[PDB]
């Protein structure tokens, strides 16, 4: 997260870190046994880390649980990034508490201008790299369809939306992928892609979760 603020320990209790001997992506807890992340975060060897603030120090209230299933959307396209969503099943259910909590799925899509909270442990610099120890947060609005298409002509599908800023300085960045965009208490987005980070006229692009609620429910029900 570039241009954000320190969230505060466990203030985003649905935020998880995906760890393969290092933090590589975020995700969002949606029930005690399932996490939503981005398809491009798929790999073997995923350990889900819940309850985290400082990802480099054991502080208390962490739960580390191996993934037992990692289910990429069957129609994920790694070139266009269409359908950039993955479900991870945890080997055992997380113990839910004030610091480890699920986030609700949407019942309807969000409108342009809705303010959302984007969070993660990704790079905090728009030029160069600095990875934070603690979780960072950014308040960001969903942009209009026309603004999003003007920023990324030919690249925005119906399963994507833009959020953030056009003036530069505030965005998600490398290491935030897979993590949440939460608006009015609902998981509306997954950090997906963009042209650089926090660059003028190039907002972040996010998977549009409201298009996948039935798919999520069916996939969980059958696994």
């Amino acid at each position: 997260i570039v241009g954000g603020y320190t969230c505060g320990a466990n203030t985003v209790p649905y935020q998880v870190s995906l760890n393969s001997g290092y933090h590589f992506c975020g995700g969002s807890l949606i029930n005690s046994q399932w996490v939503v992340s981005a398809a491009h975060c798929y790999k073997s060897g995923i350990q889900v880390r819940l309850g985290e603030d400082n990802i480099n120090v054991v502080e208390g209230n962490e739960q580390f649980i191996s993934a037992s299933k990692s289910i990429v959307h069957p129609s994920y396209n790694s070139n266009t990034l269409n359908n950039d969503i993955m479900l991870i099943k945890l080997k055992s259910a997380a113990s839910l508490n004030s610091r480890v909590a699920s986030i609700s799925l949407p019942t309807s899509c969000a409108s342009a201008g809705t303010q959302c909270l984007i969070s993660g442990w990704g790079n905090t610099k728009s030029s160069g790299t600095s990875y934070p120890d603690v979780l960072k947060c950014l308040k960001a609005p969903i942009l209009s369809d026309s603004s999003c298409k003007s920023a990324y002509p030919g690249q925005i599908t119906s399963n994507m939306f833009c959020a953030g800023y056009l003036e530069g300085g505030k965005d998600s960045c490398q290491g935030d992928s897979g993590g949440p965009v939460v608006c009015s208490g609902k998981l509306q987005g997954i950090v997906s892609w963009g042209s650089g980070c926090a660059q003028k006229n190039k907002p972040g692009v996010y998977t549009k979760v409201c298009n996948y609620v039935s798919w999520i429910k069916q996939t969980i029900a059958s696994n």
Partner: peptide, 6 residues
């Protein structure tokens, strides 16, 4: 450009 760590 995707936003994972590589």
């Amino acid at each position: 450009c995707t936003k994972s760590i590589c």
